[PDB]
RNA sequence: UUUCUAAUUUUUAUAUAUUGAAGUAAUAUGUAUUGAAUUGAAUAUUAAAAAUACAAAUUUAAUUUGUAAUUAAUAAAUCU
């Protein structure tokens, strides 16, 4: 799922393309074209730590 | 804190050295001058 | 030494018939109700298909 | 992250608390008038047994020799001793009830000296008449 | 039963009554009011009853 | 604050429907035929003839229920507010194009 | 850095959410014109025509259907 480098680049290409809080990262999830139009904001991995990803 | 705001008027307190120290008769108006001229002139114990 | 300083006012301070156009595309807050717009709930506009079709 | 520690009267402060408005009101008092009665009331302030001279003349020292007005013991202040604030130690206490006057050679200096007063917290002074106070000899 | 827990403030101010932390139990007065408003006005989004 | 922010929703429709109650009980009530149960039964007869008398109301009979209507009021305030925003384009592109003119 | 002492500079500083607004309706210059095998608001270019408000799309070989109908959602109130 192409990390849209800033959050602001996120665009809803399809009718079924909506936003979702996938663990503190605003992402776009679509039932249709499931990974084709999927976008995920750039942010730390869902389970990071203070010594590994600052 | 280390940026103290006070009247620096405070840091040379004249409580012990008023002109009745150097001019010992000034309330007596005769205005005599009996100062301690230098640390050098100290005659001794 | 020269010192540059403003003249005294004889007329209105902010220019009115001399104002330069705002400079940002004047798509007003009401043509695209993007934000900063407050409307009474009785007077909600433009729901011609949602909730103005049955107005009150 | 100022204005959190200091107030809004910080960074948004035009520390020019000297003359954004007073200078205007100085040219206001310039406009109206001063005349006999406007000195005659001051005459009563000379008639007041308490003798603190009301009007003051900010004029060059050669000028006053030519038309001496010092008769009622009025104060002769160099216009900078007013501007610089060196005159506040002799200036009325009632900033809101006192109105002295300011004589001057040409009425531009007078208002230019009375604005200095209104910068020093003074409220009423109509600020000029080089010729009236001589026509009001007192 | 007559026993009541005498407590001037609830021992757990973030307790929930739903499923999630944002379903909290104790709500700020300045939001309890904007809640009692919507439950007492027209409900043009969520059906009622 | 509760009974206030809901009064945005009802007092105006109440301030209205409490003025009609005034207009009703003042002008039409005196000349209102109280034998309605007979009157209705007359139209249930006029309908069993089919050629009955359903009459349409007139403006003067109808203007009793004339009220401040935010269905229109609130709407055409926006449109008029908007055709000023639509007005500030041709007057903007005329102003910008008027900045290229020398002094 | 004579020695005992006194002291005002401290491996402690504030991190962006409330709300998959998705019900509420047949139509009517009109499937404009041009270019087009075809195109009807959603091929291509062309875009300041109108009137009785809804031409920068999805959809279909075309249309109709069908999604959609410019809205409450105040982090500001410093936290010491
Ligand atoms: Zn999509």
Automatic annotation (TrEMBL), chain A:
Q: Which domain of life is it from?
A: Eukaryota
All disulfide bonds of the chain are 14-17
Q: What is this protein called?
A: 39S ribosomal protein L36, mitochondrial
Q: Where does Zn(2+) bind?
A: 14, 17, 37
Full-protein residues shown: 60 to 113 of 186
TrEMBL record, chain B:
The record's comment on protein family reads:
Belongs to the universal ribosomal protein uL15 family.
Write down what this protein is called: Large ribosomal subunit protein uL15/eL18 domain-containing protein
TrEMBL record, chain C:
Q: Which domain of life is it from?
A: Eukaryota
The protein's name in its UniProt record: Uncharacterized protein
The organism is Leishmania major
Q: Which span of the parent protein is shown here? A: 229 to 284 of 284
UniProtKB/TrEMBL annotation, chain D:
Q: Which domain of life is it from?
A: Eukaryota
This protein is called what?
A: Rhodanese domain-containing protein
Q: Per the UniProt entry, what species is this protein from, by scientific name?
A: Leishmania major
> Whole protein: which stretch is covered?
14 to 151 of 167
